Design a protein around this ligand. Structure first.
Ligand SMILES: Nc1ncnc2c1ncn2[C@@H]1O[C@H](COP(=O)(O)OP(=O)(O)O)[C@@H](O)[C@H]1O
Ligand SMILES: [Mg+2]
Lengths: 56, 371, 66, 56, 188
């Protein structure tokens, strides 16, 4: 019984850790992807600016 | 009170109160019924998403424009678009506001009469007035003469005006516009492997056209350069990945404007219908029209068109005249800015078609003195 | 006519340019340096988390190894 | 016995998973910071350009 | 298939009652490998994978690399002779048949359900496979709730508890008027 209680508690703690880590990963992923899209957009508008310079 | 300067257009409805600089709400004019079955219950699924809402759910809709070429082909959908514009994008009941619609030149009468009948019976406005889309674009430039080429998305028309006196016998209306360029681009993209068929993917091809295409200064030299080097190939990321690379399709799509034989149209390009429209005018106002050529409308926003057109007209015109092409940066909303200016004038305040006048003469009042 | 072109053009010919330059300067100042500093801070915290994870993993593997 | 065997086994899986998750988290965060720093270097390139534009 | 590959060590289960024992073995021991070839190589050198299990009468058995070979059949249906592609590629094919504008949302909201998706380590193998197949820009996310087994029934309870749904039932008088073929009609 003692071993069972300790094991179950350790398991539950680790499980909740797992869930929270997943949520953190998701949020950081969303922010990083938004930054990535921002970078692609800035580079593309930069190139458009370069081509505008080429025009004039 | 203030007047509502609506501008139906064909492709983007632009509206806003009179006296401002830019339209308050600009959104595509598409009404798309859902086409699949739908299994979730209580999701609150409507029967028709209009305006900018149907550009976000376009994956499961069948978008269909209610205005084909200037004329209106589906009156129920157009009524729905107007109702949305008044109530949700501006949130002003039409019972307390005059309206100023805009209409292309040389359009069928029944279209205009039905438009005024709707505005007076369904929405029940106090007074509405219909104006030609080119005179407004001439207002916005602050000129009083000049020949304006208003290449919209539905129809391209070329109205010459001198000293405020329009020349009705010199209006050259051509039905090539942005939509035909979208279809032609969608048709030439198939030469690399990319097939867009669904009415939703027409929007993606339109975005490609807006962001990448440009008008070549000299067509043959560009065709030769794009066939040897690879400095032109610009890539673009679809709404799901799988980037595509556009080669010499970049300047071949908008070249259709100057050679309408590409899409099988017989007529001459926008570079030669302007010269023909000028030559129909009297011999003493041709210099002023040459010097004050005005561009407007959305489709004239291609990078490098104000130079190609000037080169072409200078080739056609006599060598002594000076050819100048006015291309303001606010080209897209030029018609609406002009509409706001016209509605804000005091001299114009008695030209509205008052409701009692409509009650006495019927919808045919629009062709009468109140034009 | 043609006398409002000055009063609608010359205004934004300078005011718009100056205001957009001001906006770009303030946005760059607010954004870039703060973002780089915050990313360095988060990196240091991440390294500390890595050290804590290594210590805990090693001590648990030491005890549990039977 | 069945219960505690199950619990310890799934707990071990949890520990290995969570450690893999932590490696993933650190790699993602550091890559995010590197990309953000590249972006800020680009922003300061633009800011030098804006200082030039102070010419207007 | 597990009952068929267990015979490679000497354990023969034939009776329809012993299929239940093999099912219990599959539930308690099998897991989905993150990378198949590396696991096959590791299980063939070390012995850190061999987990033992006690039959309903004693005589414990030791399962070696049969642990991750049984559920691998999901991603390679050629093992049991089926032609079709695995569950990692029929999802991508099902997505690609959809319209071009809703593929991002489907990529981001891939949902797992049903009992068999409870193998330890499947939500990572499937994500790795789809990320390999899908374009590099899209984000691939696999929703694997802990209450996977009863997900269908929980959803059924929610649907039956809705007020908007209360008039969609096939009332008995309707069946009396149109016969059993009423189910294909509007009341789906
Ligand atoms: N920046 C741009 N570059 C190229 N083409 C454009 C651009 N913006 C709009 N267009 C084209 O112009 C059309 C919009 O024209 P618009 O002036 O709104 O028509 P309308 O006269 O009906 O309002 C779009 O369909 C698009 O094809
Ligand atoms: Mg227009």
């Amino acid at each position: 019984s003692d071993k069972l209680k300790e094991a179950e508690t350790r398991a539950e703690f680790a499980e909740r850790s797992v869930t929270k880590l997943e949520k953190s990963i998701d949020d950081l992923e969303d922010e990083l992807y938004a930054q990535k899209l921002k970078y692609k957009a800035i580079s593309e508008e930069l190139d458009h600016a370069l081509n505008d310079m080429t025009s004039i | 009170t203030t007047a509502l300067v609506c501008d139906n257009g064909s492709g983007l409805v632009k509206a806003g109160f009179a006296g401002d600089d830019a339209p308050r709400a600009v959104f595509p004019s598409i009404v798309g019924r859902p086409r699949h079955q739908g299994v979730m219950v209580g999701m609150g699924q409507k029967d028709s998403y209009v305006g900018d809402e149907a550009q976000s759910k376009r994956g499961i809709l069948t978008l269909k424009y209610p205005i084909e070429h200037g004329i209106i082909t589906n009156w129920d959908d157009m009524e729905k678009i107007w109702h949305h514009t008044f109530y949700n994008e501006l949130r002003v009941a039409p019972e307390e506001h005059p309206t100023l619609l805009t209409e292309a030149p040389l359009n069928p009468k029944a279209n205009r009469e039905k438009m005024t009948q709707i505005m007076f019976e369904t929405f029940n406005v106090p007074a509405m007035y219909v104006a030609i889309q080119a005179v407004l674009s001439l207002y916005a430039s602050g000129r009083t003469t000049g020949i304006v080429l208003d290449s919209g998305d539905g129809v391209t028309h070329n109205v010459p005006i001198y000293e405020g006196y329009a020349l009705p016998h010199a209006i050259m209306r051509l039905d090539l516009a942005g939509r035909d360029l979208t279809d032609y681009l969608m048709k030439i993209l198939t030469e690399r492997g990319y097939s867009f068929v669904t009415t939703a993917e027409r929007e993606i091809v339109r975005d490609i056209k807006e962001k990448l295409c440009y008008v070549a200064l000299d067509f043959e030299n560009e065709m030769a350069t794009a066939a040897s080097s690879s400095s032109l190939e610009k890539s673009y990321e679809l709404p799901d990945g799988q980037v595509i690379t556009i080669g010499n399709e970049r300047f071949r799509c908008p070249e259709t404007l100057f050679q309408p034989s590409f899409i099988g149209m017989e007529s001459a390009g926008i570079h030669e219908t302007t010269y023909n429209s000028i030559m129909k005018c009297d011999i003493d106002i041709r210099k002023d029209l040459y010097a004050n050529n005005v561009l407007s409308g959305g489709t004239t926003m291609y990078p490098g068109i104000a130079d190609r057109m000037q080169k072409e007209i200078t080739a056609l015109a006599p060598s002594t005249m000076k050819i100048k092409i006015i291309a303001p940066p606010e080209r897209k909303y030029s018609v609406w800015i002009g509409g706001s200016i016209l509605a804000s004038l005091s001299t114009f305040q008695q030209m509205w078609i008052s409701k009692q006048e409509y009650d006495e003469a019927g919808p045919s009042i629009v062709h009468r003195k109140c034009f | 006519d043609f006398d409002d072109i000055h009063r609608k053009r010359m205004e934004k010919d300078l005011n718009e340019l100056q205001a957009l330059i001001e906006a770009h300067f303030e946005n760059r100042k607010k954004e870039e340096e703060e973002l780089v500093s915050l990313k360095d801070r988060i990196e240091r915290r991440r390294a500390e988390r890595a050290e804590q994870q290594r210590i805990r993993n090693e001590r648990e593997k030491e005890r549990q190894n039977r």
